Amino acid sequence: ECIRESKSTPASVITCLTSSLQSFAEGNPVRSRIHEDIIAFGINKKQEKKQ
Amino acid sequence: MNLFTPLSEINPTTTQELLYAYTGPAPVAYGTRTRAVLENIIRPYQYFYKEPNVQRALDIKTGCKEPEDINVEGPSSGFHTASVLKLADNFFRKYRPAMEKLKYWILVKLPKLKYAELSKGRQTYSFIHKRNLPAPIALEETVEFLEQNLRRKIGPTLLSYCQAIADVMELDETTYEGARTYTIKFSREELWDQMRTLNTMWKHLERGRLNRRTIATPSMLIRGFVKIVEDAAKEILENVPTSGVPVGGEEKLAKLASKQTFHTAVTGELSGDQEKFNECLDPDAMRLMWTVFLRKLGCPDWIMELFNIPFMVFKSKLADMGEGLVYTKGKLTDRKPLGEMPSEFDDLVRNVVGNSISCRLGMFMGMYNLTSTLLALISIEREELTGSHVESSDDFIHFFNCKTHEEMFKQAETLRLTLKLVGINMSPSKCILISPAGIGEFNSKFHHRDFVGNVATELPALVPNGTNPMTDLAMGLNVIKHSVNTGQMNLCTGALAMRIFNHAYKYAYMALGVTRRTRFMEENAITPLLTNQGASPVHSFSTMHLDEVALRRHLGLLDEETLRRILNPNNPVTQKGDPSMFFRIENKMPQIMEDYSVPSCFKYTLSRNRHKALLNKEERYQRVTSIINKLFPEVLIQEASAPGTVRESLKRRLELVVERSDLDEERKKRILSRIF
Amino acid sequence: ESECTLRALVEEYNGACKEAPKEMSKQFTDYNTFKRYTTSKKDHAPQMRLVYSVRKPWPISMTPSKEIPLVFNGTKLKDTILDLGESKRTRANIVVPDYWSKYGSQTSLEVVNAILYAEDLKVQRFFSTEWGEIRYGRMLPFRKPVQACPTIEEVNPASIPHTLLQVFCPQYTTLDSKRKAHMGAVEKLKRVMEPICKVQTQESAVHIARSLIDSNKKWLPTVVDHTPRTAEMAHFLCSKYHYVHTNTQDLSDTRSIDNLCGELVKRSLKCRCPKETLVANLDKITIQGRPMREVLADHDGELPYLGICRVAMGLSTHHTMKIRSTKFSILNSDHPRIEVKKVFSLSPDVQVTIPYRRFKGKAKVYFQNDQIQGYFSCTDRQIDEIKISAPKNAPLLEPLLDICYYGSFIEPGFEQTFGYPAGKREFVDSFFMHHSKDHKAFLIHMGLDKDLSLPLSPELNWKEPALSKVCRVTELDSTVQPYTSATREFVLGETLNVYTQHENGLELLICPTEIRSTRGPLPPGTNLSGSEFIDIYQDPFSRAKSLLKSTILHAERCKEFVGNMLEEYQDPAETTVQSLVPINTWGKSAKRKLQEEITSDPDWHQCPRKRAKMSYLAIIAGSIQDRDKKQTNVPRAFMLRGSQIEYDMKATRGLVVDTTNRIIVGGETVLREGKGGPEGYVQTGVFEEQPRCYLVDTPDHGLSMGLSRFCVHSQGRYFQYEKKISIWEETDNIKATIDSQRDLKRR
RNA sequence: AGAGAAAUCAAG
RNA sequence: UGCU
RNA sequence: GCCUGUUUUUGCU
RNA sequence: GCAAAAACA
RNA sequence: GCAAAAACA
């Protein structure tokens, strides 16, 4: 449960963290992308800023 | 017209957009509707026989005519009973999945139909006030009439409503008591006449016709009955290839394209209309078709009786004559009833019932669009016809795939005759067949290689709506966006429509030139920052779907300090008169009630600047609905199912809310003390 | 405070009772009828009054407020001269919103962010898509229903109301409603609407959430192999004259669900009568916390295995017949595509029966591949006409050969051999290679003409000039697109073949044994413990965890497992057990220990610790033993094959840990001593008054405390779930009764 | 007057 | 009292 | 004044 | 669910 | 966001 939220790191990335934890527990260190991963790794951030 | 017929770059099909005088005024009707109503009454009698014999046609109850009596050189009113039976049998034998869906609807969907669906209608004739009233008002007063004449409560289902309607017909005298106080009396004959009465009235702002036509509206005593048959007809039509009425928009175009397969030697394409529709269709033919459908389905007798009630009531219809035919002595103008002095409608005097006139033939009104479509489609099912047919109500398109031209002509004539067997006459001047297929029209959709976009069918929607700047801008831009998506408007037309709409929208809100609003903004140093305030457009062709405020915030055109003021949920401009309830996700108290305002300060309400008891009753219903919604958050997501009456249900709910409020016990006691 | 809400509700109830003495004698269920009575909001032609209405002296109607000055800089902002009603009656000047744009009270930035949340999502979604290069060109539209806007989570329509109920008002729900809700969507929606519900009313927030999890498909003309997955950008990225190239992936779990369904189908085809095996397994597998039936209903994809599993659950499938890269759709046909068991006696001992499919009677099939679009008409195995709408100079080798294979038109293959037959896939590959290097069968089947108007060149190219042209191949004169009118209902074969109900028989749609797809990742959160195929997991840890959760939590499964391992009988988990334990020599000692533990304690299958010990002994017993080594005593603990995970008999460490308070299997607390629901709950009672047991706040609140009796509230009724004492579920008892009836019927 | 078209507005 |  | 049926767009409960 | 608008028959 | 006199995203 989130205590402090920062605008730099949105609290929605906890979904990415828990997905990675579950995938690693299931013997899969590498997992497919999810929607919360969009604003977690700056995917298409260069194009967004440029446009 | 030579300027509308290009020969080199584009074809005339693409220039069919130019054959539209829209953006010009739409014609209106001015005077008495009596002549039009009487003409619609007399036309079915003129078409029953090959030689018009009106006097010999008025004594006919069921219009059934021998195959040698069917007119082939003109409109033919009536049907062939054996033809209807055999064609309905053929239509049932084929399209078995459609009949299975009909059985599914009868068993499952029909019992769950609620009579509140009748409230969705527009102006409805009221048998109590003898006027046209909004559908909710007429429905509620009819429900009260049934409740206080049957001394019982009417179930929410439509079957219970129809059973109550049938039960009231069994009484000798019925009374209506309503607040102004006033009491009105109905005999069985009087209430029967009011049941079978259609209120006639002009159709205004109708484009595409030289002569004004008359529309009619039935009472709530028969709209419920028509609802069942219309829903069943829709259920059947959604599952048959030959129908075109229940689908619309792009789905209708896809269905049409699924049939534009021209592979044989001679591939025709017949597109035409049916003349004198809604008045050459005897309701008894629809009765027979529905009865055959229900017999071959194994349905019991009660459903057959229910399906047959509306068509008999329309067989006994009483069309409301207007305020009289116009008579002149010199340059005088006087309006007189039908039977006062001779006219061209003297043969119909015997059908006059007060101010209404009876007509046993035809439908007189498009209350059975889906059932008439089914009647048209059953006639198609025969061995001779091998082409693809699409029929909506009276506009049809047919595709032929024949080896020889003579075979195609024989098939076309067989189509005409089989349509005439059930009382449907092809309009000879409106039906055109192209022997090599590829060019046609259906529902004003012209196709040559693909369904070409039709500009000027979207122009009437380009005017600002007049609610408030945000809603007007949003819906105008989204209408333009839908027109672009459907192919009606391309890039250039879409952008030009955006510019025209924006300019008119800024004008309508006093944002152009020197106005009072602009002067006030100038003298007080108020920069616009919004489209409705005179700022530069933020929306583009690719950003039609984006909200103005969000896009301006993203682009930096609207700073956060002004955003904190525009989107204030406590602004006086859009403040509500009463407190509203709010959810609280994962909180000790999940519901909080507090005063609220619409977030945008530009979503204000414009004053409109100018059966009363029933309106106060609507207000009481609204208050009860509001308190129920406040106390029962779960009826907002699912249907209400709590037991008991409203008072006790909300009393127990309010209690249970209190004991979960996490307060002191004695405080809960003092709160419960003042509950009524 | 919290008391103000109760005060307001009490006063509203009292006023509504006093002001409306009637309208509450009606039943509460009459709300569904009288909520629609909202007349006096009707208006006619507001657009014909806007110009005058704005220019009226006092156009704006608002409630009386003191935040708007009566006169500001010489302009009279508000008018209170008339005050006919004095409530919602004062009128404001048109410049009042303009005045409020400045000189106005502000609001926290959090509120502004919450209000613009969905619109901001749309704006960032627009500015995050790669604006590619415009490719102008003539386009043949394809009309299909497409999703209006993207959804944070896709949920089947039946589960949307329950999801919303769990999001907004959990206190007025039952355990069945909670079970029918998509909990992932519930969590996402709660996180999203935590700030939004503070600025939106109840119904506004409810329907915002609904829109966030509702598909709302709408028909639009699209471009083939250019579907933007959502009509949000169709005006920008698509038209009849251009498309904007974009690079967007699926980012959806439909591929993983396909992988899971494919594994289930492949392992089900290896058993007796695969249909009921697949149906039973699909009713015992849960992805995350959602049952497999519900997640299959959620994902309505085009994929084959997903379609097979959806048909097995009674749902529909959108899959279309695909050959290589060309999609085929039968517009209309006289009879379903029949199959011929062409047996090939090339050798006496070596013979293979390779079946092909063809047409009988007349048929018309639409085909699409890349930008090539059109239809062809055939009679039996003879092509009558072909009409193609393709770009100029395009190579039409692969689509035409896919058509020929689809109709079995050309006859070098199918009934013949063009060379010994061996397997379907090899024969198909040989067919395609032979006709790729020798594409003359099409020309000798269709014929040649010297007319220059015909666009199909002898080298199977579009509009390229040549001396001769392929006969009966013309341009697509009018747009043609598949469309089904009647709601198609699908039939699943006993060998897991998906059929479509054609008029004169059954039309094959999906057929395994030629669906070629490599293995992929399983969906996260997949639970195969209750299923018969645990070896689907490729991880030894997951395999062992699922097997142990299956044995520990259920006594009957432990009985069956121990019995099969001890007596060397066939077991559903033989492969998993063999793959978990290394090649050892402890089988005889394990079987012994099984013997003494069974004889000493006939009542062993009630203590989960005893079940754990018996499961360990049975797993070692059913292991792959070594021949050339003498048997040794069973060890206290061993290591899983190809792993460093320790499995211990005493369950003090490693994969299974059984503390006094609880048992942990693979890091997860499978069983709790006093607070748990392993055997589940049953409803047992619906009442209009509270029963004589505790009333929990929410269904999940009562699921955590683990009381022997608790109630929940749902629309004025109380549902008091107590406990399940039966050792079997409804589903398998119904299965047993149905099989007993059918196993008395067979004589 | 005029607008207009199968009969209305141009007052009560 | 101000739409190109 | 302003019917029935289908489709579409927007906003609010 | 309601309200407004538009197209077609 | 990382990082500093502008590169990655």
Q: How far apart are CA C484 and CA C482, in angstroms?
A: 7
Nucleotide nearest A8, CA–C1', reads H1
Distance, in Å, from the CA atom of C53 to the CA atom of C143, rounded to the nearest integer, reads 42
The one-character DSSP state at B408 is H
Max CA-CA distance within chain B?
A: 95
Separation CA C95–CA B517 (nearest Å): 6
In order of C540, C592, C634, the CA distances from C562 in angstroms are 20, 12, 16
Beta strands in C615-673 (DSSP E): 637-639, 646-648, 656-658, 662-665, 668-672
Cβ neighbors of B280 (< 8 A, separation 6 or more) are B44, B47, B75, B76, B77, B78, B362, B423, B424, B425
Find residues 322-341 of chain C whose CB sits inside 8 Å of chain B.
Answer: 331
| Resolution for this experimental structure (Å) | 2.6
- Across-strand partners of C290? C287
Q: Look at C100 and B571 and tell me if their CB atoms are within 8 Å.
A: yes
Query: Are B103 and B393 within 8 A, CB to CB?
Result: no
Interruption sites in chain B after residues (C→N beyond 2.5 Å): 180, 610
Q: HSE-up of B582 (CA within 13 Å, CB side)?
A: 21
Residue A4 C-beta-side C-alpha neighbours within 13 Å: 2
Q: Which residue is nearest to nucleotide D8 (CA to C1')?
A: B30
Strand partners, C342: C354
Q: Cβ contact (<8 Å) for A34 and C541?
A: no
Cβ atoms of residues C53 and B609 within 8 Å: yes
Strand partners, B549: none
The strand pairing partners of B198, in sequence order, are B319
C190 within 8 A of C167, measured Cβ to Cβ: yes
Distances C78 to B507, C73, C84, C220 between C-alpha atoms, Å: 23, 13, 15, 48
In Å, what is the CA distance from B33 to each residue of B321, B324, B362, B366, C518?
Answer: 8, 8, 19, 18, 74
User: Is B81 exposed, middle or buried, given 0-12, 13-18 or 19+ CB atoms closer than 10 A?
Assistant: middle
What is the widest separation between alpha-carbon atoms in chain A?
40
The identity of residue B99, as a single letter, is M
| B563, closest residue in chain C (CA to CA) | C112
Nearest to C29 by CA among B109, B116, B654, B156: B156
Contact positions of strand D to protein Cβ (< 7 A): 4-8
For C145-159, b where at least 16 C-beta lie within 10 A, e where not — what string?
A: bbbbbebbbbbbeeb
Distance, in Å, from the CA atom of C728 to the CA atom of C176, rounded to the nearest integer, reads 19
Maximum alpha-carbon separation in chain C = 110
Q: Say which residues have a Cβ less than 8 Å from residue C579's Cβ, sequence separation at least 6.
A: C535, C540, C543, C641
Whether C129 and chain B come into contact, CB under 8 Å, resolves to no
Phi, psi of B192 (to 5 degrees): -65, -45
CA distance B646 to C23: 8
Measured in whole angstroms, the distance separating CA C653 from the mean position of its chain's CA atoms is 39
Is A6 an interface residue toward C (CB < 8 Å)?
no
Please name the member of C253, C256, C524 whose beta carbon is closest to the beta carbon of A22. Answer: C524
Does A18 reach chain C within 8 Å, measured CB to CB?
A: no
Q: Phi first, then psi: what are they for C312, rounded to 5°?
A: -60, -30
Tokens of B319: 């069309």
Instruction: Give the H/E segment covering residue B498.
Output: helix B491-508
C418 vs C344: CA distance, rounded Å: 12
Under 8 Å CB-to-CB from C105, ≥6 apart: which residues? B565, B568, B570, B571, C67
DSSP C158-215: GGHHHHHHHHH-GGG--HHHHHTS-HHHHHHHHHHHHHHTTTS-HHHHHHHHHHHT--
* Subunit contact C197:B584, Cβ cutoff 8 A: yes
SS3 category, C625: strand
**B492 sits within 7 Å of strand E by its CB:** no
CB B435 within 8 A of CB B401: no
Tokens of C739: 């099989």
Q: A10 touching C, CB under 8 A?
A: no
Separation of alpha carbons A51 and A40, rounded Å? 20
| Distance of C1' in D11 from CA in B27, Å | 25
**Inter-residue contact C496 to C274 (CB < 8 Å):** yes
The residues that bridge with C330 in the sheet, in sequence order, are: C365
Amino acid at C429: D
Q: Do A27 and C667 touch (CB under 8 A)?
A: no
C38 beta carbon to strand G: under 7 Å: yes
Strands C498-502 and C490-492: antiparallel
Q: Where are the alpha helices (DSSP H) in C568-634?
A: 574-580, 587-600, 608-621
Distance C72 CA to D12 C1' (A): 43
Asked if residues C315 and C282 have their Cβ atoms less than 8 Å apart, the reply is no
CA dist., res. C384 & res. B598, Å (int) = 65
Residue type, C592: R
Q: Which residues have CB under 8 Å from C699's CB, separation 6+?
A: C170, C173, C174, C175, C177, C178, C712
Q: Return the bridge partners of C72, or none.
A: C75
| Cα gap C564→C532, rounded to integer Å | 14
Q: Say how many Å lie between the first and final Cα of chain B, rounded.
A: 77
Q: Collect all residues with Cβ–Cβ distance below 8 Å to C46 and sequence separation of at least 6.
A: B465, B466, B467
State, as a whole number of angstroms, the distance between the CA of C507 and the C1' of F5.
35
What is the DSSP annotation of B100-162?
HHHHHIIIIIGGG-BGGGGGG-SSEEETTTTEEE-HHHHHHHHHHHHHHHHTSPPPSBHHHHH
CB B27 within 8 A of CB B212: yes
Minimal CA–CA distance to B412: which of B387, B440, B390? Answer: B387
Do B340 and B380 form a contact (C-beta atoms < 8 A)? no
Backbone angles phi, psi at B175, to 5 degrees: -130, 150
Q: How far apart, in Å, are the Cα atoms of B236 and each of B106, B245, C114, C382, C694?
A: 11, 11, 46, 36, 52
The residue assigned the tokens 């598949």 is: C482
Burial zone of C576 (CB within 10 Å; 0-12 exposed, 13-18 middle, 19+ buried): buried
Q: Which amino acid is at B441?
A: E
- CA B612 – CA B616 distance, rounded (Å): 7
Helices (H) and strands (E) in chain C, counts: 25, 34
Residues constituting chain C: 747
CB of residue B516 closer than 7 A to nucleic acid strand E? yes
How many Cβ atoms are within 10 Å of C358's Cβ, its own excluded? 18
Distance B338 CA to F8 C1' (A): 43
Counting Cα atoms < 13 Å in the Cβ hemisphere of B563 gives: 21
Q: How many residues does chain A have?
A: 51
Instruction: Tally the C-alpha atoms within 13 A of residue C298's C-alpha that lie toward its C-beta.
Output: 25
Alpha carbon distance B614, B620 (integer Å): 10
CA distance C747 to C741: 11
B201 close to B132: Cβ distance less than 8 angstroms: yes
Please check whether residue C318 is in contact with residue C301, taking contact to mean a CB–CB distance below 8 angstroms: yes
Half-sphere exposure of C403 (CA within 13 A, CB side): 31
Is residue B418 within a helix (H) or strand (E), and if so which, with residue range?
helix B405-421
Interface check for A48 against chain C (CB to CB < 8 A): the answer is: yes
Angle between helix B612-631 and C202-212 (nearest 10): 70
Beta strands across the sheet bearing B605-606 = B605-606, C60-61, C91-92, C78-79
Amino acid at C728: W
Strand C505-510 and strand C473-475: the pairing is: unpaired
Whose CA is nearest the C1' atom of nucleotide F13? C203
Residue B411 near residue B385, CB atoms below 8 Å: yes
Q: Which chains touch B (3 or more CB pairs under 8 A)?
A: C
CA distance C286 to C546: 12
B251, B261, B599 member nearest C364 (Cβ)? B261
Among B583, B608, B619, B668, the strongest candidate for a mutation testing the C interface, having the largest count of C CBs within 10 A, is B583
* Residues recorded for chain B: 676
Lookup: tokens for C28: 């509460």
Under 8 Å CB-to-CB from B221, ≥6 apart: which residues? B127, B142, B165, B191, B194, B195
Chains touching chain A at 3 or more Cβ pairs under 8 angstroms? Answer: C
Distance separating alpha carbons of residues C260 and C255, to the nearest angstrom = 9
Distance CA B280, CA B278 (A): 6
Q: How far apart are the first and last CA of chain C?
A: 75
By the 10 Å C-beta count (0-12 exposed, 13-18 middle, 19+ buried), C273 is classed as: exposed
Asked if B558 and B549 touch (Cβ cutoff 8 Å), the reply is yes
HSE at residue C101, side-chain half, CA atoms within 13 A, is 21
Q: Which residue of C has its CA nearest to B247?
A: C485
Side-by-side strand order, sheet with B197-202: B214-217, B197-202, B318-320, B356-358, B352-353
d(CA C670, CA C663): 6
Q: Are C148 and C232 in contact (CB under 8 A)?
A: yes
Report the 10 Å Cβ neighbour count for C705.
10
Could you tell me if A32 lies within 8 Å of chain C, comparing CB atoms? yes
Residues C618 and C565 sit within 8 Å (Cβ to Cβ):
yes
Q: What are phi and psi of C5, to 5 degrees?
A: -60, -45
Q: What does the DSSP assignment read for C711-746?
A: EEESSS-EEEE-----SS-HHHHHHHHHHHHHHHHT
**CA angle at residue C485 from C479 to C490, to 5 degrees?**
120
Q: Is the dihedral of CA C289, C292, C297, C299 positive or negative?
A: positive
Q: Are strands C694-695 and C710-713 parallel, antiparallel or unpaired?
A: parallel
C1'-nearest nucleotide to the CA of B333: D7
CA B367 – CA B121 distance, rounded (Å) = 12
Q: Which of B119, B575, A25, B127 is nearest to C34 (CA)?
A: B119
